[PDB]
Amino acid sequence: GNQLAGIAPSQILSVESYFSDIHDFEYDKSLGSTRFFKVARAKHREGLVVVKVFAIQDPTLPLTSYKQELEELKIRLNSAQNCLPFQKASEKASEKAAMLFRQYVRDNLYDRISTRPFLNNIEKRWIAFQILTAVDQAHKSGVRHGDIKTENVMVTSWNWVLLTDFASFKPTYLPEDNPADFNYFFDTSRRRTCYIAPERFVDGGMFNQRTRGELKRAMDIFSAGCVIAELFTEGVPLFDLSQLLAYRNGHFFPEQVLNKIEDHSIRELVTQMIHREPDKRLEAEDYLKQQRGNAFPEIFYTFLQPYMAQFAKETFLSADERILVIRKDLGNIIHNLCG
Amino acid sequence: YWYVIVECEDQDTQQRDPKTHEMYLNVMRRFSQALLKGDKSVRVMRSLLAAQQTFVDRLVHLMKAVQRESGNRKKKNERLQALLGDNEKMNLSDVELIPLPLEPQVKIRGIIPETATLFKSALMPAQLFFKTEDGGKYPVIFKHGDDLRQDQLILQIISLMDKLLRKENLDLKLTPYKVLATSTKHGFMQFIQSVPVAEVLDTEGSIQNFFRKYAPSENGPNGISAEVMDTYVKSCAGYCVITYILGVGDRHLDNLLLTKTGKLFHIDFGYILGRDPKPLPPPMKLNKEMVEGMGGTQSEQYQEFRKQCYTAFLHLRRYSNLILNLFSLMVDANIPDIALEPDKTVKKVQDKFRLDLSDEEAVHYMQSLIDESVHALFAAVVEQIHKFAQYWRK
Amino acid sequence: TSFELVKVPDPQMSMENLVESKHHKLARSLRSGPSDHDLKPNAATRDQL
Ligand SMILES: Nc1nc2c(ncn2[C@@H]2O[C@H](COP(=O)(O)OP(=O)(O)OP(=O)(O)O)[C@@H](O)[C@H]2O)c(=O)[nH]1
Numbered sequence: 045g046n047q048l049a050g051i052a053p054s055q056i057l058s059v060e061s062y063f064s065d066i067h068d069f070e071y072d073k074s075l076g077s078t079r080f081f082k083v084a085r086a087k088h089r090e091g092l093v094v095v096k097v098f099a100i101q102d103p104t105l106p107l108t109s110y111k112q113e114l115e116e117l118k119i120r121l122n123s124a125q126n127c128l129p130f131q132k133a134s135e136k137a138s139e140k141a142a143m144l145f146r147q148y149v150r151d152n153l154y155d156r157i158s159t160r161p162f163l164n165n166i167e168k169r170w171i172a173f174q175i176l177t178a179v180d181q182a183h184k185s186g187v188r189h190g191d192i193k194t195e196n197v198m199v200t201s202w203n204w205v206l207l208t209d210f211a212s213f214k215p216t217y218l219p220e221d222n223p224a225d226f227n228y229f230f231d232t233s234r235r236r237t238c239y240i241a242p243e244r245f246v247d248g249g250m251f252n253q254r255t256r257g258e259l260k261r262a263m264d265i266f267s268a269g270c271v272i273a274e275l276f277t278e279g280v281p282l283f284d285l286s287q288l289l290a291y292r293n294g295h296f297f298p299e300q301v302l303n304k305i306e307d308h309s310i311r312e313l314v315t316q317m318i319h320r321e322p323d324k325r326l327e328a329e330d331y332l333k334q335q336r337g338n339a340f341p342e343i344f345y346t347f348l349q350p351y352m353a354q355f356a357k358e359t360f361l362s363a364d365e366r367i368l369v370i371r372k373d374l375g376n377i378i379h380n381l382c383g
Numbered sequence: 384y385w386y387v388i389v390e391c392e393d394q395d396t397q398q399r400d401p402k403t404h405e406m407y408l409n410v411m412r413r414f415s416q417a418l419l420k421g422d423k424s425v426r427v428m429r430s431l432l433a434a435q436q437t438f439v440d441r442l443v444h445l446m447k448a449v450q451r452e453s454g455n456r457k458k459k460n461e462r463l464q465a466l467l468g469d470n471e472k473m474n475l476s477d478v479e480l481i482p483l484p485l486e487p488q489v490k491i492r493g494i495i496p497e498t499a500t501l502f503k504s505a506l507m508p509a510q511l512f513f514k515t516e517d518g519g520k521y522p523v524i525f526k527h528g529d530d531l532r533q534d535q536l537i538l539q540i541i542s543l544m545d546k547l548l549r550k551e552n553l554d555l556k557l558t559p560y561k562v563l564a565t566s567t568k569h570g571f572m573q574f575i576q577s578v579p580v581a582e583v584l585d586t587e588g589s590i591q592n593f594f595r596k597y598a599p600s601e602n603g604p605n606g607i608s609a610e611v612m613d614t615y616v617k618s619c620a621g622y623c624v625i626t627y628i629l630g631v632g633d634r635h636l637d638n639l640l641l642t643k644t645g646k647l648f649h650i651d652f653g654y655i656l657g658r659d660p661k662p663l664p665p666p667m668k669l670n671k672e673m674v675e676g677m678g679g680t681q682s683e684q685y686q687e688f689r690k691q692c693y694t695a696f697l698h699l700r701r702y703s704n705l706i707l708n709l710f711s712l713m714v715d716a717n718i719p720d721i722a723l724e725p726d727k728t729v730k731k732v733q734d735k736f737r738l739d740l741s742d743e744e745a746v747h748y749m750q751s752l753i754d755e756s757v758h759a760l761f762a763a764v765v766e767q768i769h770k771f772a773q774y775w776r777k
Numbered sequence: 778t779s780f781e782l783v784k785v786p787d788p789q790m791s792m793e794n795l796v797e798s799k800h801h802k803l804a805r806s807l808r809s810g811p812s813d814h815d816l817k818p819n820a821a822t823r824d825q826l
Pocket residue numbers: 075076081083094096147148149150151152154191195196198209229232233
């Protein structure tokens with residue numbers, strides 16, 4: 045309704061004013077504001093939190109149906125280590141605002157690509173491996189993301205990738221000729237980068253159930269395939285909205301962006317994950333099996349993945365405990381990491 | 384005075400960021416004192432501004448009396464004109480000499496009580512004629528309940544683009560009419576006397592017919608005075624390019640006004656920076672009737688108009704830095720369309736300049752844009768439903 | 778003893794990026810104060826600047 049009404053009262057008043065009402069949070073930094081979500085960092089008893097505030101300038105909009113899906117998506121991903129779902133969704137935080145609260149993570153992958161220290165070749169692979177493991181742990185859990193992009197693929201300070209901002213609310217299918225859905229829901233970073241699987245763009249003749257029909261597993265494999273291409277190019281996007289719809293119609297191909305990738309094995313992986321035909325895209329788990337040793341060192345599956353999971357656990361290994369544990373395990377680690 | 388006092392009257396800032404609100408209050412206390420510490424001729428300005436304030440306050444009280452809904456438009460107009468000539472209790476007819484807020488050089492002696500009437504719209508914009516000291520009548524529109532800050536900004540930026548192109552000697556004959564928010568819900572706008580193109584086509588049927596009725600001459604290519612059509616060509620090019628860069632959204636002919644001298648101008652800016660209530664709006668305000676005034680794409684006027692468009696565009700790219708810097712400072716300025724997406728606002732304007740295109744490629748881009756925007760007649764269809772909605776509101 | 782919003786605590790959350798801080802001091806060295814009056818960018822760096 046916010047798209048059609050466009051009325052000013054809540055939006056002009058937005059962001060810092062919302063926090064004056066809620067108790068447990070203090071505004072800290074507006075991370076970004078868009079027509080859709082007013083996203084601000086907040087301080088909280090547990091640490092930094094990201095709050096996405098939605099202004100309900102339409103009282104007839106049945107947000108309760110989105111609220112239900114948010115709690116259900118949270119319960120599924122509650123045990124996916126590389127997946128950080130929205131942990132809270134308060135319908136009644138303010139007279140006309142709804143708020144989505146989740147952990148704030150040290151860096152988003154888009155920033156991390158450029159902040160120092162630069163991700164070594166082995167680290168880019170470790171992140172790509174976790175991107176596949178994040179979508180995998182979501183897919184096996186029975187949840188699809190729907191908007192995987194480097195801005196939603198977070199990275200802690202210790203390279204633990206956390207896929208975030210699951211897009212249950214964003215439309216599954218978008219009209220090819222009307223950018224008004226893409227711009228409001230998907231282009232929140234305004235980079236024009238489009239990682240939406242091409243089979244999600246449909247003729248107006250196909251069209252409200254199209255807005256909320258279930259996401260197909262192969263729609264995320266495409267998104268993750270583009271995130272890895274961007275990561276390995278160091279910010280060069282695989283497709284913009286003009287280039288993707290042209291790619292969907294077979295009139296465009298990212299040859300120049302893919303040739304930019306140094307690792308021939310990742311360019312092969314990405315060329316598969318971003319293949320236009322959705323049936324020709326394997327499950328994320330099949331790319332993990334296929335790339336074992338071929339692109340992701342065997343160490344990642346046997347030791348790094350199960351060892352690092354120790355720190356992703358909520359039970360707080362504080363900075364002192366993490367050091368003491370690695371020191372205890374140092375002999376075991378050198379053995380497992382140096383033959 | 385008016386800019387800072389808007390912030391002091393901004394009851395939203397008074398609650399959402401009182402520290403900034405009190406800063407403006409101290410800016411006004413400082414200015415109040417800095418004038419008192421000035422020269423004799425400067426101290427008079429302090430008393431003149433105090434007079435302006437109470438003058439506008441009394442004007443607001445009169446409109447608050449009209450707003451009481453004590454009767455139909457007849458009784459409202461009667462109360463309005465009766466109060467204006469109440470030389471005892473309001474004396475707005477012949478108040479002491481004050482510089483007019485909207486344009487201080489045009490000093491005013493009072494409102495002519497016979498001429499004040501509200502237009503037929505839910506905002507009740509009151510037409511006002513000001514009894515200038517020079518004896519002339521100055522036409523102004525007073526508005527109530529409308530936060531002119533968005534128009535104020537979007538006009539004070541086209542005035543700069545008009546000025547900048549005048550520095551390049553490309554006087555496109557824009558009308559940067561002045562607007563001034565006296566408060567968050569009160570202000571004045573320069574009443575440029577003109578007929579909306581929606582009413583032109585309802586009366587004369589066409590822009591060329593209207594020009595033939597008020598500026599005919601056999602010397603021009605279509606029977607329109609060459610000096611009037613050349614003004615129209617340049618005025619159309621100026622508003623086309625400037626509404627494209629400013630992303631002005633609405634396109635209703637009810638808000639595109641045409642002057643008898645051919646200066647076309649746009650008066651609705653409630654929707655800017657790319658947003659329009661109508662989905663998939665055309666890229667620019669280039670409605671077909673605007674081109675019909677030039678006699679279509681085959682006429683000499685269209686060839687010249689295209690040249691003026693790409694030239695006006697190419698020379699604004701020369702001053703993109705200046706225009707952008709004037710938005711970054713506005714990012715927090717409470718303007719409705721800026722407050723939707725403050726950090727994106729400047730990125731939206733920067734997009735329009737296509738700074739990555741070389742100058743020859745920028746011409747070709749603008750050329751392609753205008754050659755395509757003529758065919759986006761969807762807005763001309765959807766606007767017929769908006770008129771149907773207005774029919775229930777009249 | 779408990780948490781419900783911050784599932785994955787990060788100990789370096791709001792700490793200064795010491796690696797970036799190290800790169801500041803080396804890349805933007807002030808000690809070139811006397812050399813930079815003489816030394817100036819050449820053909821390939823002129824275009825770039
Ligand atoms: N470091 C860090 N940056 C964040 C975090 N959340 C968001 N950001 C950044 O802030 C921007 C705005 O927040 P979002 O609305 O989530 O942007 P987005 O993820 O591209 O948009 P969505 O897909 O709708 O969630 C993002 O583009 C990121 O650059 C976070 O948790 N940690």
